Design a protein around this ligand. Sequence first.
Ligand code: HEM
Ligand code: HEM
Ligand code: HEM
Ligand code: HEM
Ligand code: FE
Ligand code: FE
Ligand code: FE
Ligand code: FE
Ligand code: FE
Ligand code: FE
Ligand code: FE
Ligand code: FE
Ligand code: FE
Ligand code: FE
Ligand code: FE
Ligand code: FE
Ligand code: FE
Ligand code: FE
Ligand code: NA
Lengths: 159, 159, 159, 159, 159, 159, 159
Amino acid sequence: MQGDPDVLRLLNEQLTSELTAINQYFLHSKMQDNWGFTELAAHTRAESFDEMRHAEEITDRILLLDGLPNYQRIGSLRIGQTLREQFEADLAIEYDVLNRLKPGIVMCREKQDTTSAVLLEKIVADEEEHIDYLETQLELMDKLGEELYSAQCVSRPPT
Amino acid sequence: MQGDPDVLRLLNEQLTSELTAINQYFLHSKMQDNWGFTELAAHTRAESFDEMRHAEEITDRILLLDGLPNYQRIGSLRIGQTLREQFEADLAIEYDVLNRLKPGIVMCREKQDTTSAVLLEKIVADEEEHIDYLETQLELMDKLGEELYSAQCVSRPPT
Amino acid sequence: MQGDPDVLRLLNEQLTSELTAINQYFLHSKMQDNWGFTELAAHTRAESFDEMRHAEEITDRILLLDGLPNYQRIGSLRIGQTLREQFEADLAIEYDVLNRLKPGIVMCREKQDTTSAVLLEKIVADEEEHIDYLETQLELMDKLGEELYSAQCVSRPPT
Amino acid sequence: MQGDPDVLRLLNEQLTSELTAINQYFLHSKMQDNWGFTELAAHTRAESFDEMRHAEEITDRILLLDGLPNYQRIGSLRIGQTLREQFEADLAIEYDVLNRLKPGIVMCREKQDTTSAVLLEKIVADEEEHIDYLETQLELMDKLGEELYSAQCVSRPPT
Amino acid sequence: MQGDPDVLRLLNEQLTSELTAINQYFLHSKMQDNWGFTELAAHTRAESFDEMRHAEEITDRILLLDGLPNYQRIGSLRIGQTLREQFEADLAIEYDVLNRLKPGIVMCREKQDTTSAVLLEKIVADEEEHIDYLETQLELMDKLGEELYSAQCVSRPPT
Amino acid sequence: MQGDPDVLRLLNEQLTSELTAINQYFLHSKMQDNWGFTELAAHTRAESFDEMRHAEEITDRILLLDGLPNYQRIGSLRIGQTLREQFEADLAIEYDVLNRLKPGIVMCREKQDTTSAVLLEKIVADEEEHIDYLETQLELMDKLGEELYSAQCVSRPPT
Amino acid sequence: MQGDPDVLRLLNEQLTSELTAINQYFLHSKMQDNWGFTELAAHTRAESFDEMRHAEEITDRILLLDGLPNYQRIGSLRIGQTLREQFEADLAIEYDVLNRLKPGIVMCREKQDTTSAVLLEKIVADEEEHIDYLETQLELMDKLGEELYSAQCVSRPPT
Ligand code: HEM
Ligand code: HEM
Ligand code: HEM
Ligand code: HEM
Ligand SMILES: [Fe+3]
Ligand SMILES: [Fe+3]
Ligand SMILES: [Fe+3]
Ligand SMILES: [Fe+3]
Ligand SMILES: [Fe+3]
Ligand SMILES: [Fe+3]
Ligand SMILES: [Fe+3]
Ligand SMILES: [Fe+3]
Ligand SMILES: [Fe+3]
Ligand SMILES: [Fe+3]
Ligand SMILES: [Fe+3]
Ligand SMILES: [Fe+3]
Ligand SMILES: [Fe+3]
Ligand SMILES: [Fe+3]
Ligand code: NA
């Protein structure tokens, strides 16, 4: 049984987004750890691994639909040079997901592929929470001031 | 609390298809077990028990909607005389499910019955997986050869 | 502390090779799994995860040398459409690694970066074993024959 | 305490055979493992270690009889390039053992050295079983076909 | 067994450096503890004990090479009066180590003393990580501000 | 994958030395045990088993390199008639290993085969240590006096 | 809180002696261990670690007194070439401690610094005991005879 060509292309575009985010988040976590923000880095690393899960799920869906998962293509990394830049770069990816997926889900259901729809609805919900988390860190950076904020991202003592 | 008569009719149609699948899968597994393919048989038998669970969830839904679950009607069994035929026979039932539930779900949602819809979406998801497994079994029969595939279905020694 | 720029170029090239390998091995694993070769897929999946460890190790080193780990660039995937093509495709990557690392190690040592050299020596040893595994599988295919080899790669019963 | 000179010679010849067998079987196990026949390899390896135990028992007896255990001399290895060859090679050693030890035991008892007699009687009993196993393996190859037989020697999946 | 005279000299110089580092780091840990930066103190102290382990490993190698471990000689301590100074002082030792050991290792290998080479390669790897940590600490001080940074070094409450 | 002819020859010469050592050490332990030096014999025996491990490692590396491990050829055994002679005879083998492997390693690295080099470097480190142990035993005999030294080799009471 | 200049100088002279002792004793244990006197070496080593403890205590008392602990200066090492010489060399250090600390304590108490006096009194009690031990070892050598005494220092068998 073959999936709908547009649904499949939508899934591959999402796949590319996940692969991009895996790399971007993973690199950020390494950088964060390298700067001594070890506590922050553990969180960002986990976000990276969650993206790997999404990526695998999508790959599973594509193969079931008899498509070809695209592992060759990658989007453009935005690698931040400060904590703030990193949060904002990560926000950018997440917002791009929502813009793609919101109308994509509607399309999936019009094409009577609810299983694909449901998988993307799951992703939307996960990205909304991450977007919320990030936007809250940026808020706290302003409420706290950048130094005091950063201090909450190191262990005691710093390592 | 009375359900939409069309939604109700759809649910009863799906229940008929579950009860048919239960009998078909169960019998196929007894045959497989009776032929010597005991390892395969256990798998088929479990598939039968999952159909039972689906049938019961459908029954619950119908009763909740004040409908009358149809336990009288059974569709036409396709009993396979070879492992290949049995896989093809089970495969044909699942495709009927998809063919019915795809527009079924869209309809449920238009009639503003999301709970019934979510039940059918769950079923579509499981059926797709089972279709994939069965289609994959048939491909494996071609790659391995009939005899070779069949030998992976018996225990050691054969019981 | 600043790393030798050629050493850093070498590490980044190898990084790209690891990332290419992660994707290629992961996809091959999902394809093998989707064909029914569930026993083989588990192994291949594990080979993919070692590549991820390697990539992190190289990343750590690059960061320590105050370099810029490249997560943007990816090599050409070689995707196989049979078990044989897959083994050959994965072999081609590994062989590339050796050819790059054999001179690289000598070079790292001429440049007095032994930590980087030892890292790459470790990689070489691993790749040598993976190559030996792959090449042995290809041999087995011939000794046992395609089908019979394939049968050793499915569970009982097949899943 | 001094041993009879012919008994000591008989014992030292048997030792050479053990030492020969140790090396032959161990290399075979290595080559079988290297080939992917890892299940067979473990058995062959175990056979090598039993040979080591024989060799040590013979050494003990020689030392007790105030003789000189010969660890310098070795027989000619027959290294097989196929599973069948390896079995026939191993068989050939085991037969030489019977041919030597049968008259040897009668001799030991004639010379009233029953302890050496009993040691040699145990080795004969052990070699007969090993020979029988090798013969069965050669037979199974004929009954199952070589490829099919080989497949019973790999693990699932082939490691 | 006699060691090469230059290798032995290289080894004894490294020993002096270890002995120097042991004392410097230990005093620093004591002064950090004494200042109330008790969380930092424990890490620094641990660093001192790793130095002790290095020193013992070097001594073992010298003794094995029939040389004379020099425990009389010591380098000039650089005792810091601020946390920043202490970090810079400690850094200065670690850099001298790299500067000595880099050419030293090539020399050991030229003289075909690989065991001494490997020991020195391990120390380099360890020193690079320590240097990186010190650099990160210096950086964190800049990013967090000195007071804020210091506060990440006291316990709650300050003991 | 095919190994360099000089590296393979180097590895095989070393394998010959390991096999030779295994025999010499094992027989020495048996003699020591038969003289009543049961405590010393246990250590000598364990040394033999370590040689067995090295021989397996070399064998594996040869097989990976697609060479033929030589199990046919054994070096000349020096079998000591006193503890001192045994000690000295074992020293002579070990010093031959160092003699070969020192330029051997350098050549391995010139030929860009680091995995092989690293195996031999490990072997050299172990041998340097066994030489230390043996030379110290010989020193102890001179210090304590042979009778007294021998007494430390027996159990209480002697067995 | 500021300590008396003579008390501080007293404490620092003693610290210098502890640091000197640590080195002399540790190196002696390493030599003893390398001569095969492994049992004796363990005790000598533990003595070194006890000196380390005294040095930390003195360091703490100095810091509390607001002085500068001297970790730059080490006394003259007497490194014995035989057990007897090592024993005698260690005695000489210990007797110097008593020589200093005896009037040292009295002066401490005249200056109304009992905490410091009590630390030194503890040190003296420990040293008197280590002197007893060492003098008894030297007596034992005369009684048993050096060879025999040495034999009690090795394990069975010697390692
Ligand atoms: C037709 C409507 C049926 C319904 C709604 C139903 C429901 C269930 C359910 C919920 C279970 C529990 C196990 C599981 O769900 O996996 C079960 C077990 C079982 N089913 Fe059915 N079933 C039906 C008919 C049948 C038929 C036609 C057979 C033919 C053999 C059958 C044979 C069995 C057996 C032997 C068990 C195990 C009993 C036990 O474990 O004590 N059932 N059934
Ligand atoms: C591209 C840079 C990547 C890095 C640096 C990386 C790193 C890692 C590491 C170190 C692990 C754990 C290894 C272990 O525990 O054995 C891991 C797990 C995993 N990887 Fe990746 N990986 C990368 C890309 C990918 C890609 C392209 C996929 C495609 C599916 C993927 C899928 C996964 C999954 C599903 C897990 C398991 C997650 C978990 O168990 O929590 N990764 N990754
Ligand atoms: C001559 C060529 C030989 C080879 C290639 C060889 C190989 C090996 C290897 C690789 C081991 C691994 C030990 C471990 O992993 O701890 C081993 C163990 C052992 N060796 Fe040998 N060895 C040889 C000769 C001998 C001889 C002459 C004896 C005489 C008794 C012997 C007796 C043993 C025994 C009893 C063990 C351990 C048994 C066990 O692990 O179950 N070996 N050997
Ligand atoms: C030179 C100035 C030194 C100072 C001030 C010093 C200080 C100390 C102190 C106070 C302890 C406490 C031990 C205990 O509480 O049981 C200790 C333990 C120890 N010392 Fe040192 N020591 C010095 C030199 C050395 C040297 C040259 C070595 C050579 C190996 C060494 C190796 C060790 C080790 C391995 C421990 C225990 C490790 C642990 O507790 O985790 N020390 N040292
Ligand atoms: Fe995602
Ligand atoms: Fe996310
Ligand atoms: Fe169903
Ligand atoms: Fe189903
Ligand atoms: Fe890799
Ligand atoms: Fe690999
Ligand atoms: Fe035998
Ligand atoms: Fe046998
Ligand atoms: Fe160090
Ligand atoms: Fe360090
Ligand atoms: Fe060896
Ligand atoms: Fe050795
Ligand atoms: Fe003291
Ligand atoms: Fe003392
Ligand atoms: Na089979």
